[PDB]
Amino acid sequence: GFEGGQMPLYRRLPKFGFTSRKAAITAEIRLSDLAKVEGGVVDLNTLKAANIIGIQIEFAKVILAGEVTTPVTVRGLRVTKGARAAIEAAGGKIEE
Amino acid sequence: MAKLTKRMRVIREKVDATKQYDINEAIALLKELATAKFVESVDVAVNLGIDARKSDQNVRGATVLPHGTGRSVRVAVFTQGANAEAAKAAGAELVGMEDLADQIKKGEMNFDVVIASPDAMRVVGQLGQVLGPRGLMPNPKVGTVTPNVAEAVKNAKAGQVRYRNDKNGIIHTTIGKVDFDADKLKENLEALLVALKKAKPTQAKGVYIKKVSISTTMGAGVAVDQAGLSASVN
Amino acid sequence: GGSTRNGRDSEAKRLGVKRFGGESVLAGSIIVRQRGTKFHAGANVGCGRDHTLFAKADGKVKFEVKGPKNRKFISIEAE
Amino acid sequence: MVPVVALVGRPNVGKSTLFNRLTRTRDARKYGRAEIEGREFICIDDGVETRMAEQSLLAIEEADVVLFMVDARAGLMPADEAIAKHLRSREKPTFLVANKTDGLDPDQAVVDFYSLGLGEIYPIAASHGRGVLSLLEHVLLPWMEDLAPQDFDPQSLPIKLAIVGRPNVGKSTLTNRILGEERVVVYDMPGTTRDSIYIPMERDGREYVLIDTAGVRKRGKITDAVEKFSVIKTLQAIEDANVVMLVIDAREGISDQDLSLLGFILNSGRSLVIVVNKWDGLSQEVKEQVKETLDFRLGFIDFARVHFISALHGSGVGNLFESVREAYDSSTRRVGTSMLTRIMTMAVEDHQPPLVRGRRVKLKYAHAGGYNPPIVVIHGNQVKDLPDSYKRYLMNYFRKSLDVMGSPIRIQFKEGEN
RNA sequence: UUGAGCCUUGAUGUGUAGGAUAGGUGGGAGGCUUUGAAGUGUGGACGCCAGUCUGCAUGGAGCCGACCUUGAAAUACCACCCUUUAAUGUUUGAUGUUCUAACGUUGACCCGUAAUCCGGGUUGCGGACAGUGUCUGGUGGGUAGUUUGACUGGGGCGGUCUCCUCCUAAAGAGUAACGGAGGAGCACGAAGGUUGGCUAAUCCUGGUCGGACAUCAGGAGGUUAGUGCAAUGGCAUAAGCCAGCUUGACUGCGAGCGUGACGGCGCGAGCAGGUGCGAAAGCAGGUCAUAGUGAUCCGGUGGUUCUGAAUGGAAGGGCCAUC
RNA sequence: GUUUAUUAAAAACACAGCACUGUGCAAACACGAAAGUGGACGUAUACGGUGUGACGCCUGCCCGGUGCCGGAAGGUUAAU
């Protein structure tokens, strides 16, 4: 990725983001990872029996995806506005 | 000239060398000690560093504090284009630009504390040429060169603590009289003590509080069981 | 003198003519170092910084001089 | 006798910025005036340097009106208040202005300021454009009621001289002497250039400069954040000369930078007179004949003339004044195509114009392209047909056959015949 | 012997006013400072000494300022630390001198050893030095690594390198050359904004002083003038020119375009919000247009919770703005 | 006299003589991180360095005393 003694284009651009580290401990699980609910209860530490989900989890959100039509738990798991919408409609705990 | 520095040596040898005293005990002491003939002043002598910035160091003024009581002062709220129109809604005190304008330009004044927006402030509390007071005078700064007017009136109505000398990086603040009660005084200190920690964001040394000392006059003074430090605000 | 301090670099003028697509901005006549020698008019407000015909929302050039004399008048008539 | 705006506002900051914006006249240099309409007036410019307090104190008492300055971000400042008080007591009128006014429309002026033992603070402009108009008008009105003070011969200008040297020696002190013999300080700054720079000043009409960056006894208003800016000044010192003086020490002089400095001087194309200052304390067997010898051999054909002064005694004082004049006469010498052609013939006959590619060249006249630093342009054969060396040989010859205690003289060659 | 680091005494602060000598008082005109309190040197704004001059040597007035004025201030009782200056406590470093005990001893001898080495011992002489170890300033082509462009009608020489306009430039366009010509490295808050208004040069002719006008008067003339600073293109709907009034050189966005390989650069109505001016329509997003400058780093300034490592704060970093 | 062995013998290099400086012994200095060694079993008529080049002949200018020369800061002479 070079260009001789015409200046680096990316040394013709600046840097600007910033890391989070929290980031690496924020996982991202799906609606259809309630497929792997493996116990009627959606619990972070059951989903590691799926191994669908981080070792060093501290955080996670549950996102949209297909449906499974079953009671679920979800506590200490974030769930999105749209995500929670239909798994509400299957019954199951889901208050947090 | 200087005969012998003996009378001051024996006296300072009694009660200063950072002999830390209960704040209240100090005040109990403070009225007399060496023959000072009447009840005197309660002071805090706070030592701040540096030159090139101030936040409340060498202030020829008075600032609002938690526990404003000690004195209550005369107050007029000058409401001109600012946070004045919020003050008009507030309706505490007297709010009016052109009538209080007149009252400012009349020939006579007594509304010491100008909570102000642009025109009034310049008159009252600052003026003279070689200004300076009969022993006390209407003062200028009251944080309305940091204008707010409505909320300002609540704080203002209540009262206010004046301190002043000149130019040294060590900020003295006269806490009150001994015709004010011991525990109300303590609270005055604590209030100023919380403020100061607050004060100064501009790095030049990250703890700006050295000595909180409490003192009166006639070689009589003590130190505080220092409690201004950095930990949050205490 | 003996100089040769040179390089030319504005370029571009008169791109297209008449029907030009039609578009919210035309180039129309961005036509440079002038304000007249291609004179503004029609379907388009203002003579651009460098004097631009750029639609009122749309436009084929209508061209064609007017007044009792004077100018040459470039006009824009909507597409 | 005559007014001066006389900026003050604390020792430094944007204080200077404002003077440049009020002036426009360079090379009158310093003192120096700000022009408004018809009338022009001067401008003048804790724990601070003792020397800097002495000059500043010297400025304001002769000062005839004063201008006290505050910044946008500046407000409160007891020190400012002290300077303001001093001014009242001693008694001259002061107006309170505020620099690059900013804020967010006029607000915090006038409110703090009434305590300043001064009233109405006018806010200014310098990077916008309205706020200068009021100040200039205010001053104007009293000042309009009043109306206060506002070949070419060698004597058509008064002799221009600089005093350049090391970034070590207390040259500024030597500068104080040269201007003195009166036993008085003189490095009181006024402002009249574009931006924050620097003193050339004149006494006896004739100009002296003080230069380099620290050790010079440059402890001034400040303007050279690095080693660079000062150099921008010394190059000014070149522009202005027909004479430059090099101070060197006998105990830190001829440093590497310094010998380069002399080499540079040769470029600078201006007359060299060599000064050694603070030379009454040196050891009885001097180190220093050899130090003169190493510079001599490089070698500078001029007239020397060595000076052994001190700024803390003075010995050399007359001999320096004298040497520059003599040097200027030779340098500025009335010249003339005839003289040049006549001495030249001898030279070429004697030692042989160079031949190039079995074709012998041809010289055929010289004329003077100016005299002040003497330049000649000789029309002969092509540029490369001579080496620079023979040019110099013929030049050196002229430098020899008609006295030049002055500056190096210059030779040129043009072609047309071949 | 002698510098200075610190310690607490010293007392006060020039414009009319202000007695002079107005650094800096919580609170502010009782403190029964009891003693019959004082005007007499340091101090003090400043020597502008005076006098007022000092908690600063007299006893002479209730215990006593022997209450304020008046200016900005100044008199009941005093308070808050500075500049300044001692006296005293010191604390410490220099020099001065002498010493011996480290240490040196390429003095002399004894001895292992009928060994110029060395070691030990004795004594003589030097002596807290000298020297060396660290740290540390100056010097240092002696030694060391390398740096010293490119365009180029051979190169070096010279001159030149960015940016703009014009022509060459072959009529979309775009454009070489060591082609030809010229310039630019800003200026400017009015030269901006907006309303309302106003209409040259150049020449004739005639008139005080009036000269090739200086104003005045008319006539001719028809923009050849003048444009913020080239030069060109452009310029009366003036952009000019004159004046009133303003601060849009606003803010947050942006259909959609032109024009650059890319870095990117330029134009752009409208919406939205807030504004400004204008009677109202309406106009205002810096300048007649075209030049007036530069990536990326890394650091400075201000703002923000965004980040933030046991855990809370806190630092630094990101962000937003700006240098 | 000496010399570029394996191009170049000289006007080059050398040289006495002279000149200049540096060095008091644990010497200068030189090598050798240093120890040590050389310098020297010597001892300023030397020792080391440096430099000039027989020889003869061309005149090589001491700042102290006191004075002088330029200069300022002073002294001294002035108005006072």
Side-chain angles (χ1 to χ4, degrees):
Chain A
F2 193 48
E3 67 217 271
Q6 180 293 103
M7 218 300 133
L9 65 87
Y10 36 82
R11 210 77 134 99
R12 236 154 58 234
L13 283 186
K15 35 290 284 171
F16 43 81
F18 212 62
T19 54
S20 305
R21 307 184 279 271
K22 178 162 79 174
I25 56 178
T26 299
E28 309 176 340
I29 48 177
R30 307 200 309 139
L31 226 69
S32 283
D33 299 340
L34 315 177
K36 302 188 172 198
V37 58
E38 314 313 290
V41 292
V42 170
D43 285 56
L44 77 83
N45 42 273
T46 320
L47 289 166
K48 294 186 82 187
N51 175 235
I52 201 57
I53 199 171
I55 293 302
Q56 64 292 307
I57 281 295
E58 292 279 69
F59 304 99
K61 311 180 97 200
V62 181
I63 25 271
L64 209 50
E67 202 62 30
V68 74
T69 309
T70 311
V72 278
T73 294
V74 188
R75 289 284 191 279
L77 290 290
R78 258 156 279 96
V79 60
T80 85
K81 55 124 182 66
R84 55 170 300 136
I87 37 170
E88 281 170 268
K93 310 169 181 197
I94 197 173
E95 299 193 72
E96 287 184 30
Chain B
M1 194 64 161
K3 207 165 175 300
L4 233 164
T5 190
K6 190 69 179 278
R7 191 256 136 191
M8 293 85 170
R9 293 286 281 203
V10 70
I11 286 289
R12 295 157 59 238
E13 273 175 291
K14 296 195 169 66
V15 296
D16 214 80
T18 330
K19 299 195 189 68
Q20 283 165 271
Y21 265 58
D22 158 39
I23 187 153
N24 271 234
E25 189 65 64
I27 286 153
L29 190 51
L30 249 60
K31 310 159 176 72
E32 290 91 58
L33 194 156
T35 188
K37 306 82 165 172
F38 189 40
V39 305
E40 320 187 41
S41 186
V42 189
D43 172 62
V44 84
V46 175
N47 296 26
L48 290 193
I50 65 66
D51 180 273
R53 287 89 68 253
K54 310 150 276 307
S55 282
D56 270 330
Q57 175 182 287
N58 307 317
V59 183
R60 281 184 173 261
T63 170
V64 165
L65 287 150
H67 307 143
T69 42
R71 306 87 198 198
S72 190
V73 70
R74 293 101 279 167
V75 46
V77 176
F78 180 62
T79 46
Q80 166 178 19
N83 289 287
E85 278 71 56
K88 294 195 177 64
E93 219 280 289
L94 309 173
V95 283
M97 173 179 184
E98 287 175 37
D99 298 340
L100 279 302
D102 205 297
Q103 191 194 263
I104 306 266
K105 300 176 189 286
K106 182 158 179 316
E108 186 179 303
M109 247 287 127
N110 206 2
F111 305 82
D112 305 289
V113 176
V114 205
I115 297 299
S117 292
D119 301 293
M121 215 290 93
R122 38 176 162 79
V123 182
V124 188
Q126 36 190 306
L127 236 179
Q129 275 60 358
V130 195
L131 191 62
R134 215 166 91 191
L136 173 69
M137 187 165 198
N139 297 92
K141 183 162 165 172
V142 272
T144 52
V145 275
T146 39
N148 184 264
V149 188
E151 291 69 63
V153 180
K154 298 192 307 301
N155 302 105
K157 200 173 304 181
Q160 209 173 24
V161 175
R162 165 264 145 228
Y163 48 95
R164 61 157 325 298
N165 277 64
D166 302 59
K167 94 179 64 178
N168 201 265
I170 291 163
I171 192 59
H172 63 280
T173 300
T174 44
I175 287 300
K177 292 197 72 181
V178 298
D179 294 0
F180 303 128
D181 62 282
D183 295 289
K184 110 82 211 86
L185 296 155
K186 186 199 169 46
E187 287 196 266
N188 195 279
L189 274 111
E190 292 169 74
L192 272 146
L193 256 37
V194 170
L196 287 156
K197 160 57 213 49
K198 304 205 288 302
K200 183 237 64 63
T202 309
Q203 302 183 227
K205 263 165 293 285
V207 176
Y208 193 39
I209 332 178
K210 287 69 156 170
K211 296 152 50 275
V212 186
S213 286
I214 201 295
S215 188
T216 191
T217 330
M218 214 180 179
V222 295
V224 198
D225 274 62
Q226 53 193 342
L229 319 187
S230 296
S232 184
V233 93
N234 168 248
Chain C
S3 311
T4 177
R5 308 177 171 153
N6 31 246
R8 71 186 107 287
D9 38 273
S10 49
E11 334 299 299
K13 281 188 177 180
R14 66 155 146 160
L15 181 66
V17 283
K18 212 220 182 163
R19 283 162 179 266
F20 192 47
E23 191 44 54
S24 92
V25 160
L26 309 165
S29 286
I30 76 156
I31 306 197
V32 304
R33 307 157 67 263
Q34 70 76 243
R35 183 167 159 175
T37 290
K38 283 312 175 174
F39 184 51
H40 61 92
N44 185 65
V45 56
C47 53
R49 263 275 286 118
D50 50 358
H51 295 282
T52 301
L53 277 50
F54 59 96
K56 66 160 157 299
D58 296 286
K60 33 176 182 296
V61 195
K62 179 158 174 180
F63 296 107
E64 213 289 287
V65 69
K66 52 189 72 178
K69 307 290 161 301
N70 301 100
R71 298 305 221 219
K72 160 143 188 152
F73 283 95
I74 310 305
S75 188
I76 310 297
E77 193 287 305
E79 277 174 278
Chain D
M1 71 193 312
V2 72
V4 47
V5 154
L7 307 173
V8 259
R10 74 119 311 210
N12 202 7
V13 214
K15 186 172 124 182
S16 47
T17 320
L18 185 60
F19 74 75
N20 58 269
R21 210 26 278 130
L22 292 182
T23 51
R24 180 153 286 240
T25 313
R26 304 179 88 248
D27 308 321
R29 314 183 313 191
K30 293 303 179 59
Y31 303 92
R33 308 171 183 277
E35 56 180 309
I36 177 61
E37 302 188 291
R39 291 132 305 286
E40 319 182 309
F41 295 106
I42 329 183
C43 303
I44 248 168
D45 281 59
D46 188 75
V48 299
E49 235 300 314
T50 284
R51 294 188 183 206
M52 281 304 307
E54 184 147 300
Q55 324 290 269
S56 291
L57 285 183
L58 208 280
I60 67 93
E61 302 181 293
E62 189 44 16
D64 185 358
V65 184
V66 171
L67 233 76
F68 199 97
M69 285 175 74
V70 157
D71 312 321
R73 312 207 291 184
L76 294 158
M77 170 48 78
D80 93 58
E81 281 67 279
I83 307 285
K85 302 279 179 167
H86 304 334
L87 218 309
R88 185 169 70 246
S89 292
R90 70 117 291 100
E91 188 66 81
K92 281 288 108 192
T94 299
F95 290 99
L96 188 53
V97 311
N99 185 45
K100 51 186 196 185
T101 215
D102 299 316
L104 190 68
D105 302 324
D107 278 295
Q108 278 285 292
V110 200
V111 182
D112 295 92
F113 305 91
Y114 249 73
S115 314
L116 201 22
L118 297 174
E120 196 179 30
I121 160 164
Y122 318 97
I124 339 167
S127 283
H128 202 98
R130 40 193 188 265
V132 284
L133 303 182
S134 311
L135 317 200
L136 298 164
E137 198 269 321
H138 174 48
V139 287
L140 272 164
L141 185 286
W143 305 356
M144 280 172 81
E145 318 306 79
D146 304 308
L147 288 190
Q150 169 173 170
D151 294 308
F152 296 119
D153 320 304
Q155 55 238 62
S156 306
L157 278 166
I159 43 171
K160 282 290 125 292
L161 329 77
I163 319 183
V164 49
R166 300 214 317 293
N168 294 104
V169 50
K171 185 166 58 277
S172 294
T173 325
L174 177 55
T175 304
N176 194 29
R177 183 174 298 269
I178 284 172
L179 275 168
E181 289 183 359
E182 305 164 50
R183 204 170 199 172
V184 313
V185 291
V186 78
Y187 47 101
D188 44 78
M189 300 144 216
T192 202
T193 64
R194 182 56 71 86
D195 296 306
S196 29
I197 25 160
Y198 221 59
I199 311 195
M201 73 185 272
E202 293 183 0
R203 186 203 67 94
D204 191 7
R206 300 145 194 180
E207 201 179 293
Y208 311 91
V209 187
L210 66 79
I211 213 87
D212 219 345
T213 208
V216 158
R217 264 171 172 165
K218 148 55 171 294
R219 305 189 188 193
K221 172 179 208 307
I222 94 88
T223 187
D224 182 8
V226 282
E227 300 185 33
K228 302 170 179 156
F229 249 87
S230 46
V231 194
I232 305 163
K233 321 162 193 168
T234 309
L235 281 170
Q236 289 298 111
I238 309 177
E239 173 189 351
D240 294 296
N242 51 250
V243 167
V244 289
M245 276 83 97
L246 185 73
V247 196
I248 61 161
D249 282 3
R251 56 241 73 118
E252 262 294 80
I254 71 138
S255 299
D256 300 277
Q257 196 136 10
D258 202 51
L259 279 177
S260 298
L261 212 75
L262 270 159
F264 181 29
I265 240 77
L266 193 77
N267 292 296
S268 310
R270 300 274 55 178
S271 301
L272 170 69
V273 182
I274 301 188
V275 189
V276 196
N277 186 52
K278 330 194 168 171
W279 206 92
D280 193 71
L282 204 74
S283 54
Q284 287 281 38
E285 188 264 1
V286 295
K287 269 60 176 165
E288 188 287 297
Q289 308 274 3
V290 183
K291 300 191 164 184
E292 303 186 308
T293 317
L294 190 156
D295 284 350
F296 206 85
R297 285 183 313 185
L298 305 189
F300 302 109
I301 314 170
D302 34 291
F303 190 89
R305 176 156 52 177
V306 295
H307 299 301
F308 299 114
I309 334 186
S310 193
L312 304 302
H313 184 250
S315 304
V317 194
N319 287 291
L320 190 271
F321 289 172
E322 197 186 333
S323 188
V324 306
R325 174 62 67 148
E326 299 288 304
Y328 182 49
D329 292 313
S330 306
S331 200
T332 200
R333 243 168 184 192
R334 186 110 75 167
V335 278
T337 173
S338 62
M339 321 306 176
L340 298 179
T341 306
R342 49 193 77 184
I343 71 85
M344 182 170 30
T345 304
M346 312 154 170
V348 295
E349 293 295 327
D350 204 300
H351 48 79
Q352 293 199 272
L355 295 103
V356 164
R357 294 195 285 235
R359 179 185 54 241
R360 48 173 59 201
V361 294
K362 174 174 300 153
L363 294 83
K364 84 192 174 176
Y365 98 125
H367 71 14
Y371 52 82
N372 165 52
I375 166 153
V376 312
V377 46
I378 307 190
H379 170 35
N381 275 240
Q382 310 183 121
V383 184
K384 59 186 165 76
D385 282 16
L386 306 123
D388 304 321
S389 37
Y390 190 71
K391 310 193 181 67
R392 296 264 171 75
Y393 190 14
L394 294 166
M395 189 175 69
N396 295 327
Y397 201 96
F398 177 38
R399 195 179 293 180
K400 204 191 307 310
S401 303
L402 198 65
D403 296 276
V404 178
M405 213 333 72
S407 201
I409 66 182
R410 290 190 277 173
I411 201 174
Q412 196 67 45
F413 277 85
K414 175 176 68 165
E415 69 202 296
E417 65 207 89
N418 187 249

Tab-separated table of all heavy atoms in Angstrom, chain D residues 335-357:
chain	number	residue	atom	x	y	z
D	335	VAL	N	32.788	56.528	-8.187
D	335	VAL	CA	33.369	55.698	-9.236
D	335	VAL	C	32.457	55.749	-10.412
D	335	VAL	O	31.380	56.334	-10.299
D	335	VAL	CB	33.541	54.176	-8.989
D	335	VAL	CG1	34.912	54.076	-8.154
D	335	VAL	CG2	32.332	53.756	-8.090
D	336	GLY	N	32.852	55.077	-11.530
D	336	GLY	CA	33.504	55.710	-12.705
D	336	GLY	C	34.225	54.705	-13.583
D	336	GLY	O	35.076	53.953	-13.131
D	337	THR	N	33.794	54.652	-14.817
D	337	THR	CA	34.212	53.637	-15.810
D	337	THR	C	35.673	53.939	-16.037
D	337	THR	O	36.380	53.005	-16.370
D	337	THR	CB	33.514	53.849	-17.156
D	337	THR	OG1	34.059	52.960	-18.174
D	337	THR	CG2	33.573	55.262	-17.703
D	338	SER	N	36.179	55.228	-16.043
D	338	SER	CA	37.532	55.431	-16.497
D	338	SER	C	38.594	54.741	-15.716
D	338	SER	O	39.485	54.113	-16.267
D	338	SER	CB	37.751	56.965	-16.420
D	338	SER	OG	37.647	57.593	-15.114
D	339	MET	N	38.488	54.837	-14.303
D	339	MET	CA	39.542	54.380	-13.403
D	339	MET	C	39.821	52.977	-13.410
D	339	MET	O	40.943	52.428	-13.385
D	339	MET	CB	39.163	54.735	-11.926
D	339	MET	CG	38.481	56.122	-11.770
D	339	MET	SD	39.366	57.558	-12.453
D	339	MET	CE	38.084	58.706	-12.098
D	340	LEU	N	38.702	52.310	-13.522
D	340	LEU	CA	38.558	50.917	-13.512
D	340	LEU	C	39.146	50.221	-14.656
D	340	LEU	O	39.914	49.268	-14.520
D	340	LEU	CB	37.110	50.519	-13.547
D	340	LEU	CG	36.208	50.951	-12.391
D	340	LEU	CD1	34.748	50.501	-12.550
D	340	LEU	CD2	36.678	50.473	-10.989
D	341	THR	N	38.917	50.764	-15.843
D	341	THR	CA	39.487	50.317	-17.133
D	341	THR	C	41.013	50.474	-17.143
D	341	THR	O	41.765	49.576	-17.553
D	341	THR	CB	38.819	51.079	-18.324
D	341	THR	OG1	37.426	50.907	-18.214
D	341	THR	CG2	39.386	50.391	-19.574
D	342	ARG	N	41.495	51.604	-16.608
D	342	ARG	CA	42.896	51.920	-16.634
D	342	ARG	C	43.671	50.997	-15.698
D	342	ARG	O	44.724	50.489	-16.072
D	342	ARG	CB	43.240	53.363	-16.352
D	342	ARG	CG	42.626	54.017	-15.148
D	342	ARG	CD	42.829	55.519	-15.206
D	342	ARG	NE	41.896	56.216	-16.153
D	342	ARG	CZ	42.127	57.552	-16.279
D	342	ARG	NH1	42.998	58.238	-15.485
D	342	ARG	NH2	41.560	58.238	-17.300
D	343	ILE	N	43.232	50.791	-14.428
D	343	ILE	CA	44.009	49.918	-13.566
D	343	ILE	C	44.014	48.438	-14.077
D	343	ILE	O	44.922	47.645	-14.004
D	343	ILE	CB	43.631	50.104	-12.106
D	343	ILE	CG1	42.290	49.602	-11.640
D	343	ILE	CG2	43.823	51.621	-11.719
D	343	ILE	CD1	42.092	48.135	-11.213
D	344	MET	N	42.813	47.992	-14.673
D	344	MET	CA	42.515	46.679	-15.213
D	344	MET	C	43.429	46.253	-16.202
D	344	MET	O	43.930	45.095	-16.272
D	344	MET	CB	41.130	46.647	-15.967
D	344	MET	CG	40.761	45.262	-16.512
D	344	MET	SD	39.102	44.983	-17.156
D	344	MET	CE	38.628	46.559	-17.776
D	345	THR	N	43.858	47.189	-17.143
D	345	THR	CA	44.737	46.843	-18.214
D	345	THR	C	45.985	46.286	-17.734
D	345	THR	O	46.577	45.354	-18.303
D	345	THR	CB	45.084	48.086	-19.112
D	345	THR	OG1	43.997	48.746	-19.641
D	345	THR	CG2	45.933	47.624	-20.303
D	346	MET	N	46.514	46.927	-16.608
D	346	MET	CA	47.796	46.540	-16.019
D	346	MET	C	47.719	45.080	-15.606
D	346	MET	O	48.617	44.282	-15.733
D	346	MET	CB	48.086	47.398	-14.690
D	346	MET	CG	47.840	48.959	-14.910
D	346	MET	SD	47.422	49.878	-13.394
D	346	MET	CE	47.597	51.427	-14.211
D	347	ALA	N	46.556	44.791	-14.913
D	347	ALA	CA	46.424	43.555	-14.216
D	347	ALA	C	46.525	42.406	-15.210
D	347	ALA	O	47.092	41.398	-14.853
D	347	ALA	CB	45.041	43.672	-13.521
D	348	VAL	N	45.784	42.484	-16.371
D	348	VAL	CA	45.537	41.441	-17.393
D	348	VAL	C	46.801	41.308	-18.090
D	348	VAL	O	47.207	40.232	-18.504
D	348	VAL	CB	44.267	41.737	-18.332
D	348	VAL	CG1	42.987	41.703	-17.424
D	348	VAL	CG2	44.321	43.029	-19.136
D	349	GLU	N	47.550	42.398	-18.275
D	349	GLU	CA	48.844	42.313	-18.975
D	349	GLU	C	49.820	41.611	-18.155
D	349	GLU	O	50.607	40.895	-18.658
D	349	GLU	CB	49.531	43.666	-19.245
D	349	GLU	CG	48.746	44.588	-20.306
D	349	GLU	CD	48.726	43.972	-21.648
D	349	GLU	OE1	49.723	43.283	-21.979
D	349	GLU	OE2	47.732	44.277	-22.425
D	350	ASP	N	49.784	41.843	-16.837
D	350	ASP	CA	50.691	41.291	-15.935
D	350	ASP	C	50.504	39.827	-15.680
D	350	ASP	O	51.582	39.128	-15.589
D	350	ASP	CB	50.678	42.037	-14.548
D	350	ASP	CG	51.999	41.846	-13.801
D	350	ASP	OD1	52.407	40.725	-13.483
D	350	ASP	OD2	52.619	42.893	-13.419
D	351	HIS	N	49.315	39.306	-15.524
D	351	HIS	CA	49.052	37.979	-15.078
D	351	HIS	C	47.785	37.545	-15.804
D	351	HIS	O	46.927	36.962	-15.063
D	351	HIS	CB	48.908	37.994	-13.580
D	351	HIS	CG	47.979	39.093	-13.076
D	351	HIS	ND1	46.559	39.179	-13.021
D	351	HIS	CD2	48.399	40.230	-12.478
D	351	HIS	CE1	46.253	40.276	-12.245
D	351	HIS	NE2	47.297	40.955	-11.910
D	352	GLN	N	47.544	37.932	-17.060
D	352	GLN	CA	47.269	36.864	-18.045
D	352	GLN	C	45.836	36.510	-17.933
D	352	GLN	O	45.419	35.884	-16.982
D	352	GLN	CB	48.241	35.615	-17.976
D	352	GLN	CG	49.663	35.988	-18.387
D	352	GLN	CD	50.507	34.739	-18.790
D	352	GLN	OE1	51.152	34.080	-17.942
D	352	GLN	NE2	50.538	34.499	-20.108
D	353	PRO	N	44.930	36.938	-18.740
D	353	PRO	CA	43.493	36.531	-18.637
D	353	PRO	C	43.400	35.109	-18.976
D	353	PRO	O	44.297	34.790	-19.817
D	353	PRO	CB	42.714	37.475	-19.654
D	353	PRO	CG	43.841	37.905	-20.636
D	353	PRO	CD	45.126	37.817	-19.858
D	354	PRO	N	42.576	34.228	-18.409
D	354	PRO	CA	42.594	32.774	-18.733
D	354	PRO	C	42.145	32.491	-20.156
D	354	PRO	O	41.409	33.209	-20.759
D	354	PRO	CB	41.698	32.144	-17.735
D	354	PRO	CG	40.638	33.284	-17.419
D	354	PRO	CD	41.538	34.485	-17.430
D	355	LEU	N	42.650	31.395	-20.787
D	355	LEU	CA	42.279	30.949	-22.095
D	355	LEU	C	41.313	29.814	-21.969
D	355	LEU	O	41.386	29.084	-20.993
D	355	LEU	CB	43.507	30.426	-22.865
D	355	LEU	CG	44.549	31.468	-23.158
D	355	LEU	CD1	45.809	31.401	-22.231
D	355	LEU	CD2	45.058	31.210	-24.539
D	356	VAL	N	40.301	29.681	-22.879
D	356	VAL	CA	39.413	28.560	-22.735
D	356	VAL	C	39.144	27.897	-24.056
D	356	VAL	O	38.473	28.493	-24.911
D	356	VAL	CB	38.141	29.081	-22.099
D	356	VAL	CG1	36.967	28.076	-22.244
D	356	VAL	CG2	38.385	29.252	-20.575
D	357	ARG	N	39.624	26.658	-24.201
D	357	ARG	CA	39.439	25.750	-25.328
D	357	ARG	C	40.149	26.209	-26.557
D	357	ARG	O	39.662	26.139	-27.653
D	357	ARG	CB	37.930	25.413	-25.668
D	357	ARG	CG	37.158	24.611	-24.582
D	357	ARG	CD	35.821	23.962	-25.060
D	357	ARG	NE	34.747	25.102	-25.180
D	357	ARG	CZ	33.525	25.100	-24.552
D	357	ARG	NH1	33.048	23.912	-24.078
D	357	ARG	NH2	32.842	26.265	-24.436
